[PDB]
């Protein structure tokens, strides 16, 4: 039996420019090569990519942020290669120390740079944001994609702006390193007694853990149900076919309920933003108003 | 009372609202539960069925407001087996061409599907100016056997997804010189032929026709698949 | 009662086991015989929890805990109260779990549609083998396994995770959390995107999937496809679970010592390992 997890036949042809509607094509690329190897799994067209000016600015603001973590790099490595390539995953961009405050008048190697490696890491995720929902307005869909990217931005805004602020330091935010942001993780839960018992974290587990279980039944159940064209859900909502009624047939005779081919969506775009929604909660009531966490859990 | 405890009762409020306002929404199709012979059920659950939602479709092809009033638009062969309710309705003829159970298809629009500019979504690869096989193998010509291991026919062409690139049917001449489509997920395409398992070879001429040459109905379509999956179930005495 | 579009699907045929003996539904839940031995397992196990609640004195959900057995008891059986009802509930789970996807067979054939969903569900009864039998028979005693406890159990993943140092060393932890991480991103931008589209800016025709297409090739330059992302979202969440499992049964087993001294064979390359300065220098 035929499983539909990789493509049998791949066929190609006259690249897709893409839908107009209010795009402005200047702005647009060439497309580029087709992919053989991505054809086997999805569509083996690349490109073409919109490039604007929050695009530029983007790109341009985020390569800054990663060249001063590097040059960083460098330097904690005496600008010896050897030494860069060994100690990589153990450099790390610290911010300003406690005494600092939220100043900015620490000097570049005491987290001065770690104050301009955030600023450019700001302006490249804000700017970001904004390209997500002027993409989705030129082709008149709706702004879903802005809102839920707002979830993740919001966890990121409190780890390392927003809590650090509260607490009245920049020191309280997260390092610039591979190892050493796990090891600021570590500590984190220590110095709060434990985030097993913060409910907001456990809330973000829930959610964390439930959308590898909705995307494993909902992927699972398009395949399933690809014999029957379930994958063209677009066309399924507007006209429900044998595959939208199988798919919900399936799960109500397994569980008891069902959803529609639009509303699995709701549900998959729910379980997901409230990962880093409940954890922004979590983190940002931290220290902020729990001390220790397992301390305030015997109260309740 | 601190700030801890009123956020965290806070967002069971809320979530209990979201799983009210997701699970009506999950019910704009299929609702209201019906007995069945029909009639409404008397037990609906505890949610209420949610307010009526226009989708504009596009393509001057209309507007859907759902929910709605629901019908098949079909008849239906089967046959209640038991006065209680929960047991199987037991096919009264032949259920692959009555289209029931795993051969069941709905009576979608018979009209094509669309691309993002109003041309058809799926075309014959001979209609379908550039497009070729360009990985794996080519089944244009191979032979086409059943679960049985008799040859019903030879691939002609394929019907390709011009959109998303991809190849949907294989379009299958008959030993008598008709076609027919095949999905594309229900084929095994080998080295020196294709086997489909879900049918035997004299059940091919019984796969439902389609009035064009060059296009294909979501109404064929569900026809098609809808037949082809029932022979798991309905042409397995014959599966060797 | 049915959905008004269920009738032509509820026929007979489709069972592994007992024929038409079991084939019929209560509501909307399907039998089958797998659905009467998932009740059985379930109902079981559930009584022996309840029944371990009342040796330990508290009919508290948030209390409740079954411990396996302690380690001295190796592999071997023991009392109820000491760790046998965990040994019997281990089993009905296992009973329960493994009937469960069996009747999602029998209705994937009923259904003739694949079976790509029982087949997803037994990854993660794998990742429950790999730290209820798998990881504690390797090491040798049942103890090893986890508590049934709602708090208990959360306990066990500190203890646990800290006897290696920061479990966050452990390289294919690493690997299966990119692949959480990942997962949740894809369902949120596919969820999203679907919306999108069904769901356009108001005086607007619903989009076409075209400009699902055309919205990411314009957002990052590349498309998957509909079809493509259902099969990632499959792809992301296994594999998340598969290198969970991976994770664990690799600690205590393979490896006993702190995680990060597993990176030091990169640190301490015999060319560079002496190089003065950075961080190990
Ligand atoms: C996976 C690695 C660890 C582990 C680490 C953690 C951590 C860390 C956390 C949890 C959390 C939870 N875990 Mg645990 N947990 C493990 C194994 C399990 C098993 C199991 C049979 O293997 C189960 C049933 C649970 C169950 C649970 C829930 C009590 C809770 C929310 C999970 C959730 O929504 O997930 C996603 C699934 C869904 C959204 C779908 C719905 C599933 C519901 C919630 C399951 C309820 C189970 C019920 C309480 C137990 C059975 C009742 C019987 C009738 C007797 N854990 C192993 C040992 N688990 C979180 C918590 O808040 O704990 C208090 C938390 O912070
Ligand atoms: C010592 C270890 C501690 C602990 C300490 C913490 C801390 C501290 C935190 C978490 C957090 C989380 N933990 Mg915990 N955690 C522990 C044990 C666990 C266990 C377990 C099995 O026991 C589990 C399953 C989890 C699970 C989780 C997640 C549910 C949650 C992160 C959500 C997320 O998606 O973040 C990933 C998503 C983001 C970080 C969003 C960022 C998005 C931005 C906008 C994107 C950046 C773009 C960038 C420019 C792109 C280029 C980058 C290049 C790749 C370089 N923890 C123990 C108790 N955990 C977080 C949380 O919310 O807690 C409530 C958190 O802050
Ligand atoms: C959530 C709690 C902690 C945290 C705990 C962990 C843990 C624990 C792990 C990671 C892992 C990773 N983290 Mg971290 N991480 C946090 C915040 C961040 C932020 C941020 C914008 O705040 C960034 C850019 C990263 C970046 C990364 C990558 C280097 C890596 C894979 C991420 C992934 O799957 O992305 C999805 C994006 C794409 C696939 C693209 N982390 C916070 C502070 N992170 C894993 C790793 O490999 O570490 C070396 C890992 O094991
Ligand atoms: C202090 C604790 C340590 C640590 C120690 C451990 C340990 C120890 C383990 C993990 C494991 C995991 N950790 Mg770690 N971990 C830490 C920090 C983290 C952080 C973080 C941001 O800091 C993250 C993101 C993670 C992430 C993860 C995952 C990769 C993994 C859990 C998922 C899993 O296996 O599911 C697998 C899924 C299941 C087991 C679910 C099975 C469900 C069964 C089949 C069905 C249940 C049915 C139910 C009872 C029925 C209810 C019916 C009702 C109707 C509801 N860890 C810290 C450093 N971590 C675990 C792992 O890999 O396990 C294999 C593990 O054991
Ligand atoms: C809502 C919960 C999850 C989520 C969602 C999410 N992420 C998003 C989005 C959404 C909805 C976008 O629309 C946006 C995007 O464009 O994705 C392709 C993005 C994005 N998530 C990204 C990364 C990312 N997301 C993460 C996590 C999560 N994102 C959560 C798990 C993580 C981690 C650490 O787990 C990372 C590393 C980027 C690939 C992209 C944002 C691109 C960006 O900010 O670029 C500016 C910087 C440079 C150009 C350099
Ligand atoms: C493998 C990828 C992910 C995944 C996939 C997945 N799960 C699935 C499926 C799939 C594809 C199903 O088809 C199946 C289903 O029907 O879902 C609705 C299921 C399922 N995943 C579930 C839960 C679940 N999945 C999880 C995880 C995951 N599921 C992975 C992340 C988790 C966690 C902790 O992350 C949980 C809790 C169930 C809702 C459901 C399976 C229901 C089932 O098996 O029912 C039969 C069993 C009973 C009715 C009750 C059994 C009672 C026992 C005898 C006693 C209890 C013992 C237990 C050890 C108690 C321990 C409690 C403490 C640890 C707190
Ligand atoms: C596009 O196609 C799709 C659909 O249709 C269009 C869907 O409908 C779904 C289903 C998904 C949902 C409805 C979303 C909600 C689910 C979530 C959040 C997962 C988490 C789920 C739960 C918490 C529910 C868990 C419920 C149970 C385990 C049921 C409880 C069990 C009972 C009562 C026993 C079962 C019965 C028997 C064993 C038989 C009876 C026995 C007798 C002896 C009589 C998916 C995936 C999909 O892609
Ligand atoms: C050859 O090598 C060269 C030099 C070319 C390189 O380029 C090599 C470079 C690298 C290998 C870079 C490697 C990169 C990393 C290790 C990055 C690791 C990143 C993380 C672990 C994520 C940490 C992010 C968490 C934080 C703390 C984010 C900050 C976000 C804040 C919301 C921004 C806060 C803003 C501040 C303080 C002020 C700015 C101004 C405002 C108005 C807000
Ligand atoms: C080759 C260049 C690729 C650049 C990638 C940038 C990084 C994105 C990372 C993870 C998210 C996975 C992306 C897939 C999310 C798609 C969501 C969806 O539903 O897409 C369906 C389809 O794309 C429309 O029809
Ligand atoms: C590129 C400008 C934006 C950066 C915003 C944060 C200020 C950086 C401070 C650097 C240290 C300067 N000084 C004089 C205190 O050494
Ligand atoms: C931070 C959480 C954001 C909520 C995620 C769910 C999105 C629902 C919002 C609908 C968007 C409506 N609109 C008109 C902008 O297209
Ligand atoms: C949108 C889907 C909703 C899923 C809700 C799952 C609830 C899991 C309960 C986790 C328990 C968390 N808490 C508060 C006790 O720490
Ligand atoms: C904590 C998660 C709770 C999920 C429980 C879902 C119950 C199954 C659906 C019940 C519908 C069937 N019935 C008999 C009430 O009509
Ligand atoms: C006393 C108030 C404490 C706030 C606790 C959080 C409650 C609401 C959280 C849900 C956020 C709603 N949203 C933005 C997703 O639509
Ligand atoms: C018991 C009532 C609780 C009310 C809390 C509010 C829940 C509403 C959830 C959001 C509704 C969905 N929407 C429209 C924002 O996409
Ligand atoms: C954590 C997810 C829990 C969601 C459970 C809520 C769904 C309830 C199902 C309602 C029953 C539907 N019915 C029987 C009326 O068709
Ligand atoms: C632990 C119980 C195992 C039951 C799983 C039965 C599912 C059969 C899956 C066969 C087809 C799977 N796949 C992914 C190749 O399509
Ligand atoms: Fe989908």
New interface residues.
Partial sequence: ?????F????????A?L??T?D?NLAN??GV?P?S?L?????????????LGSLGVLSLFSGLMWFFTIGIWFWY???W?P??????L???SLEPPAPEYGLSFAAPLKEGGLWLIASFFMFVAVWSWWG??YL???????????A??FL??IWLWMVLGFIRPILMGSWSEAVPYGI?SH??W??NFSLVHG?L?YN??HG?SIA??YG???????????????????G?????Q??????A???????W???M??????????????????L?TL?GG?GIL?SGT??DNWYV?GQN? | FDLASLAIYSFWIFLAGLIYYLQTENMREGYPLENEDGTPAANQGPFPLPKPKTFILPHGRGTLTVPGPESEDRPIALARTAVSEGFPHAPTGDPMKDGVGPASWVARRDLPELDGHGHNKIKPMKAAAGFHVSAGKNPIGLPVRGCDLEIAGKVVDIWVDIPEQMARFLEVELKDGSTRLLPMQMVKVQSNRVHVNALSSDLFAGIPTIKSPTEVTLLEEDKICGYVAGGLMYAAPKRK | ALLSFERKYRVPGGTLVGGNLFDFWVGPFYVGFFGVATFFFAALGIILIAWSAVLQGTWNPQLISVYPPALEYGLGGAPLAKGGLWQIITICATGAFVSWALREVEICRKLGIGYHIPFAFAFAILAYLTLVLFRPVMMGAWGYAFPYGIWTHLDWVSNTGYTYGNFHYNPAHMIAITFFFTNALALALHGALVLSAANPEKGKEMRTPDHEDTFFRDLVGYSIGTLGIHRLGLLLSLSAVFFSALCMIITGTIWFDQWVDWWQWWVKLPWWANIPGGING
Wanted: hydrophobic content about 50%.
């Fill in positions: 039996e035929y499983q539909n997890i493509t049998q036949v791949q066929v190609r042809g006259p897709d893409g839908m509607e795009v647009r690329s580029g087709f053989t991505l054809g086997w799994f999805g569509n083996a067209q690349l490109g073409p990519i919109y904690q490595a005496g010896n050897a030494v860069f390539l060994r100690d995953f153990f450099f390209r997500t993409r989705a307005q030129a082709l008149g869909m709706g702004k879903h994609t809102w839920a979830s993740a190892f796990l090891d993780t570590n434990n097993h409910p907001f809330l959610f964390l959308s590898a279980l909705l995307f494993a039944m909902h992927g699972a159940t398009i395949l399933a149900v690809s014999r029957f064209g994958e063209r859900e677009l066309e909502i507007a006209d429900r076919g044998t939208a009624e199988r798919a919900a047939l399936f109500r005779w397994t008891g309920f069902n959803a529609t081919m639009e509303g699995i969506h709701r549900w998959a775009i729910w379980m997901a933003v990962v409940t909660i009531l108003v729990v305030w309740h």
